[PDB]
Amino acid sequence: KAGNWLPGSKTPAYLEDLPGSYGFDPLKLGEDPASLKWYVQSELVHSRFAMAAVAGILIPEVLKAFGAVNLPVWYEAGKYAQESSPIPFNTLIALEIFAFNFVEIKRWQDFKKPGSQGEEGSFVGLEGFFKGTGENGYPGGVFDPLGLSKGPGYEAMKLREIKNGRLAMLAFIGFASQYLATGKGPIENLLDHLSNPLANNFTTNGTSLPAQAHPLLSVLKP
Amino acid sequence: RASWLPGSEIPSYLKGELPGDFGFDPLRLGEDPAALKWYQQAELQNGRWAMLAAAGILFVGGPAAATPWFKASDFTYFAPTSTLFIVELLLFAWVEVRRYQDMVKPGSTNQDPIFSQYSLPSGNEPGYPGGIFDPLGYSELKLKEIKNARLAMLAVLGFFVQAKTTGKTPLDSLSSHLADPWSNNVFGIEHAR
Amino acid sequence: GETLIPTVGFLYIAGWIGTAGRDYLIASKGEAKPREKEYIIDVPLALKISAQGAGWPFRVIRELQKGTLLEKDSNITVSPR
Amino acid sequence: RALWLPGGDAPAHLDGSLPGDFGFDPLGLGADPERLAWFAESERVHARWAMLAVAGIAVQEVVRPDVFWYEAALKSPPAAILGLVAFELFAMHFVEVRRAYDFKNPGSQDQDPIFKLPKHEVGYPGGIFAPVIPGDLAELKLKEIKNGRLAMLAFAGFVMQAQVTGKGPLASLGDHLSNPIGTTIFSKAVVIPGQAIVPPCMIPSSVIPTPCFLSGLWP
Amino acid sequence: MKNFTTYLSTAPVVALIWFTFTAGLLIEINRFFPDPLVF
Amino acid sequence: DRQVWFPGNAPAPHLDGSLPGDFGFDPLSLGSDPQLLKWFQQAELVHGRTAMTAVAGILFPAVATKAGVVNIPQWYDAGSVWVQNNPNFPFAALLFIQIILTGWVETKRWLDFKNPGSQADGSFLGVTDDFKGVANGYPGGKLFDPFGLSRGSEGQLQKYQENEIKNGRLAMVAFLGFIAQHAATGKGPIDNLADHLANPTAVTFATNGVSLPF
Ligand code: CHL
Ligand code: CLA
Ligand SMILES: CC1=C[C@H](O)CC(C)(C)[C@H]1/C=C/C(C)=C/C=C/C(C)=C/C=C\C=C(C)\C=C/C=C(C)\C=C\C1=C(C)C[C@H](O)CC1(C)C
Numbered sequence: 010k011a012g013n014w015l016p017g018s019k020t021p022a023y024l025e026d027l028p029g030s031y032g033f034d035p036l037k038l039g040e041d042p043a044s045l046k047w048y049v050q051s052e053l054v055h056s057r058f059a060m061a062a063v064a065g066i067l068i069p070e071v072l073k074a075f076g077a078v079n080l081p082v083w084y085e086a087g088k089y090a091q092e093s094s095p096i097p098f099n100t101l102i103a104l105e106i107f108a109f110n111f112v113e114i115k116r117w118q119d120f121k122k123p124g125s126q127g128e129e130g131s132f133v134g135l136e137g138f139f140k141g142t143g144e145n146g147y148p149g150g151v152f153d154p155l156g157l158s159k160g161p162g163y164e165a166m167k168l169r170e171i172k173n174g175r176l177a178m179l180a181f182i183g184f185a186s187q188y189l190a191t192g193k194g195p196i197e198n199l200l201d202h203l204s205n206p207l208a209n210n211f212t213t214n215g216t217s218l219p220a221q222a223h224p225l226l227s228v229l230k231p
Numbered sequence: 232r233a234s235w236l237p238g239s240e241i242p243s244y245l246k247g248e249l250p251g252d253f254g255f256d257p258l259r260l261g262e263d264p265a266a267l268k269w270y271q272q273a274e275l276q277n278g279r280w281a282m283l284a285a286a287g288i289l290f291v292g293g294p295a296a297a298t299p300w301f302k303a304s305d306f307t308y309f310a311p312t313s314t315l316f317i318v319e320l321l322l323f324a325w326v327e328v329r330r331y332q333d334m335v336k337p338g339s340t341n342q343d344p345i346f347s348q349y350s351l352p353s354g355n356e357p358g359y360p361g362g363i364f365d366p367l368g369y370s371e372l373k374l375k376e377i378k379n380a381r382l383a384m385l386a387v388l389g390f391f392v393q394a395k396t397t398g399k400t401p402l403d404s405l406s407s408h409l410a411d412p413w414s415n416n417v418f419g420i421e422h423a424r
Numbered sequence: 425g426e427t428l429i430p431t432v433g434f435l436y437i438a439g440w441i442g443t444a445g446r447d448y449l450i451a452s453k454g455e456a457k458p459r460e461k462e463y464i465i466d467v468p469l470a471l472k473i474s475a476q477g478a479g480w481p482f483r484v485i486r487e488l489q490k491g492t493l494l495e496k497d498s499n500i501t502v503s504p505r
Numbered sequence: 506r507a508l509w510l511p512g513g514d515a516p517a518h519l520d521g522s523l524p525g526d527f528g529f530d531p532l533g534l535g536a537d538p539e540r541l542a543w544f545a546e547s548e549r550v551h552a553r554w555a556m557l558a559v560a561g562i563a564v565q566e567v568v569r570p571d572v573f574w575y576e577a578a579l580k581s582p583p584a585a586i587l588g589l590v591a592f593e594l595f596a597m598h599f600v601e602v603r604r605a606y607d608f609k610n611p612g613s614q615d616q617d618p619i620f621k622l623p624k625h626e627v628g629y630p631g632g633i634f635a636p637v638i639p640g641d642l643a644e645l646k647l648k649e650i651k652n653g654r655l656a657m658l659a660f661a662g663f664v665m666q667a668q669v670t671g672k673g674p675l676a677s678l679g680d681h682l683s684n685p686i687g688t689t690i691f692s693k694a695v696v697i698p699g700q701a702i703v704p705p706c707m708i709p710s711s712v713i714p715t716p717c718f719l720s721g722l723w724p
Numbered sequence: 725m726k727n728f729t730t731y732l733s734t735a736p737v738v739a740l741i742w743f744t745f746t747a748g749l750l751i752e753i754n755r756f757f758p759d760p761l762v763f
Numbered sequence: 764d765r766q767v768w769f770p771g772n773a774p775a776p777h778l779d780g781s782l783p784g785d786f787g788f789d790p791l792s793l794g795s796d797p798q799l800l801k802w803f804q805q806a807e808l809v810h811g812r813t814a815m816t817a818v819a820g821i822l823f824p825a826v827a828t829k830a831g832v833v834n835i836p837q838w839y840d841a842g843s844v845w846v847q848n849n850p851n852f853p854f855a856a857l858l859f860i861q862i863i864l865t866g867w868v869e870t871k872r873w874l875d876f877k878n879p880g881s882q883a884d885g886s887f888l889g890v891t892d893d894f895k896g897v898a899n900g901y902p903g904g905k906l907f908d909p910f911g912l913s914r915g916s917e918g919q920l921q922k923y924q925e926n927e928i929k930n931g932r933l934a935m936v937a938f939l940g941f942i943a944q945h946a947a948t949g950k951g952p953i954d955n956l957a958d959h960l961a962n963p964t965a966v967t968f969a970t971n972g973v974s975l976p977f
Binding site: 012013015016017018205207208210212213218223225226229230231 | 842846847849850851852853854855856859871874875877878881882884886887
């Protein structure tokens with residue numbers, strides 16, 4: 010186990026060997042093993058989506074703060090890309106539906122029957138791409154072109170993926186909540202916090218602590 | 232045994248096998264043997280590029296050799312800035328895949344691809360090759376290299392931070408500190424914002 | 425906000441209440457005196473089960489697919505037809 | 506053994522091995538062995554530091570009678586103060602961690618790290634630090650700790666006398682010798698039920714904040 | 725104290741405590757957020 | 764046996780004299796269950812230590828204010844004065860910081876109560892022995908007891924435990940007195956003591972005007 014999320018608590022035995030495990034399941038969602046396998050895949054998929062999304066938000070924002078690029082902010086990039094997009098909105102949705110239906114059905118079929126997308130005659134001659142590794146959530150093949158899963162740092166890279174994945178998931182939800190609460194981008198929120206941490210935080214954004222539910226805010230003030 | 236802190240406990244995985252082994256690992260970073268081998272190679276690589284960088288920064292007449300090193304990219308050459316980046320990327324890609332393949336399987340990249348008679352001698356270490364990389368038989372010397380590499384790494388970091396806060400060249404920083412050291416140093420300069 | 429979101433909120437709380445009650449009843453079924461826990465409440469157990477009812481849809485859906493949510497028809501009493 | 510309270514009883518954890526041991530520990534602060542060793546090192550360094558401080562303040566009062574020792578840092582021979590702080594911190598850090606790893610690992614810090622020190626006692630360096638010894642070991646240890654405790658008490662007196670009088674130690678002694686009945690703390694400070702007379706502190710509140718040490722609880 | 729807490733765990737006492745909590749929660753929500761018709 | 768709170772009455776049978784401050788006082792038998800009794804022992808210790816710190820932080824600033832050296836506000840006004848003097852520090856930010864810090868330390872104390880010595884595994888910054896705990900409500904170690912007054916001798920530890928529990932109960936009663944006296948006089952406690960010292964036969968609860976609303 011990587012550790013204990015709550016020192017002194019009794020950690021569940023079914024999480025003892027999973028990568029990235031801190032024994033954290035107070036709601037007992039993963040007590041059933043089939044549920045646990047499904048949730049391991051779901052956590053990895055959420056982690057990788059959030060990882061790529063937080064990269065595609067933070068790196069343009071960091072390079073914009075450094076004066077390098079001037080790409081649009083993340084919550085308005087849909088509008089600016091759509092006007093210049095040669096493909097209209099409805100066609101983009103239909104294409105995304107088709108492509109993700111295909112790839113997610115292939116991933117789902119591999120989850121139910123491991124290695125079944127790599128068998129002979131499975132794909133149209135290209136089935137060697139998708140042989141799998143016998144590990145839930147770690148496909149390999151085309152998805153591991155450099156073959157770094159065969160190296161000796163593979164187990165530590167699994168742990169690195171999950172913890173960075175959880176951090177990225179929290180970060181994207183923070184991006185969305187910060188936009189909804191302040192109306193500014195994430196780097197501007199960080200700079201405002203760095204300028205005055207006591208006064209520039211969630212307790213003063215006027216949304217996170219609703220005024221009706223917290224009457225002492227309008228009272229205990231200068 | 233020499234150590235960075237005489238009189239303290241030494242980690243059990245650092246027994247002087249490696250050069251420059253003074254038991255310095257307060258954060259216990261490289262514990263598993265794959266990590267320690269990778270960080271050995273990375274220390275060698277970063278230290279050698281930092282030795283070259285410290286030399287090339289301290290060495291710099293001529294209009295080009297009067298420019299700051301952090302403003303050096305704005306000098307005009309025979310190619311646009313994009314072209315040299317990709318050419319350097321290509322040459323580095325070739326030599327780095329050679330060095331990486333040596334790092335994975337030792338002795339795998341020892342033979343000249345176009346000359347079958349020209350081959351690096353066997354028993355080659357990953358970070359310590361032989362043959363045409365050692366034209367003289369100069370090979371105690373690894374402690375010297377790792378010490379100069381670490382000093383150059385700290386020097387290059389000092390170049391980067393000094394050009395970031397004061398906005399000054401390294402020679403200007405040394406001359407400012409040599410004017411009055413008790414007022415022109417990291418204290419006072421940063422305390423004057 | 426008029427009916428649909430209240431429908432989701434009610435159904436979440438109602439499934440929470442029902443799942444907590446079912447969990448408490450199942451846990452009490454294994455005691456030596458199962459009827460005693462029905463009118464003298466095991467309050468720490470009830471509070472623990474009540475807290476765990478937040479994750480009810482996941483557990484209930486897994487019981488549905490696994491086949492453990494429902495008792496088999498051969499184990500349930502019926503009157504003569 | 507001579508005891509701080511004759512006719513009394515020394516505590517069990519104070520056997521008498523340490524120099525200047527008179528069985529004075531009513532709080533039981535040294536009733537742990539490793540705490541007793543650490544507190545012995547602390548008392549030694551406090552004694553020597555207060556000893557040098559009392560000597561230096563007395564000399565500064567004698568030599569430069571126009572300079573208040575409390576405000577002696579205003580008159581010290583403007584951004585160069587930060588560099589001197591850096592030099593002092595570096596040198597003090599080096600010598601202090603040398604002493605501390607002498608304490609933690611006895612004999613490990615007993616060799617010159619540039620070009621050696623004899624085997625000695627923890628807290629008693631010897632070697633180059635002790636070139637001449639005009640006496641015996643236990644006797645001079647007793648003198649060192651007694652003079653050190655006297656100097657610690659004297660430095661506390663120097664500080665609080667500077668607060669309540671605004672003047673140096675020998676000037677305060679001269680004021681006491683001029684009027685022995687109207688210069689003591691009993692002479693100017695009185696608290697009775699219903700009325701308290703608290704003498705003011707002549708040191709200003711700030712210059713850098715310069716608070717009088719617990720002046721609101723003065724008698 | 726064990727017998728007293730067993731009495732406090734009898735069904736009507738638990739019902740009283742739980743419904744006092746639930747009714748108080750509903751009352752205080754409607755005091756702090758008066759007249760909620762829609763979400 | 765030992766001295767009891769009501770002489771001539773047998774002490775409460777579930778109290779046996781092992782706990783510090785055991786005078787046999789439990790007329791409602793709230794400590795009948797031993798585990799609930801250990802929980803109430805930790806409750807009493809936390810209440811008493813908090814009361815001692817708070818009573819010190821009221822009495823010493825009020826004594827210094829009464830002397831005229833400083834102008835620290837009375838304890839019932841200090842939050843208002845602080846908020847009026849700190850407009851760049853909002854009340855909610857201060858409350859959030861206090862809640863997360865006390866949550867960390869109190870959850871560590873709670874988990875040690877549930878599993879004694881379980882915070883000794885080195886998860887918090889490598890701390891092992893200093894978080895093991897000596898007894899229920901008495902952590903000890905080199906962090907909570909850095910002068911080592913619990914590791915000297917047994918009788919010294921029992922003496923200090925008696926001192927702690929008796930001063931803690933006195934400070935709890937004193938804070939109750941602070942609340943009652945402020946409600947009855949509208950002044951601070953040192954102001955009350957000074958008014959009583961100036962004229963004791965006239966300055967009594969009977970003449971404050973609210974204890975006897977006749
Ligand atoms: C994670 C997906 C996602 C999220 C969070 C957003 C969020 C946003 N987009 Mg973008 N978009 C997203 C995906 C896409 N957008 C666009 C195209 C645009 C345009 C053209 C514009 C935006 C704008 C906006 C903002 C307007 C708010 C809004 O309308 O709510 C939408 C809220 C969402 C949560 C997104 C949609 C719901 C969901 C996340 C879709 C994906 C769910 C899966 C398909 C479910 C599949 C089920 C499986 C099990 C079979 C908002 C910040 C605009 C705005 O800023 O106005 C100035 C703007 O003009 N988006 C496309 C191309 C088809 C997407 C493809 O996935
Ligand atoms: C464990 C609690 C529990 C659960 C999971 C169910 C579930 C069900 N009930 Mg049963 N019911 C309960 C308690 C419960 N009931 C009690 C206490 C009574 C006596 C009032 C009934 C009387 C009853 C009737 C008369 C009918 C049902 C029906 C149903 C079914 C449809 C849902 C419904 O109509 O809800 C309606 C539920 C009620 C009207 C009573 C609910 C009372 C509370 C809210 C539930 C009890 C909570 C419990 C005390 C929590 C303790 C847990 C704690 C200690 C941890 C479903 C099988 C219907 C049917 O059979 O459908 C096919 C039907 O006609 N129920
Ligand atoms: C009892 C208990 C036990 C445990 O504990 C758990 C729990 C969960 C709690 C529970 C369970 C249960 C059961 C299983 C259920 C199932 C059922 C049936 C089968 C359904 C059908 C069948 C159903 C179906 C028909 C349905 C529905 C449909 C309709 C149209 C709807 C509509 C809509 C909605 C959307 C909403 C909105 O707003 C409106 C409307 C318009 C109204």
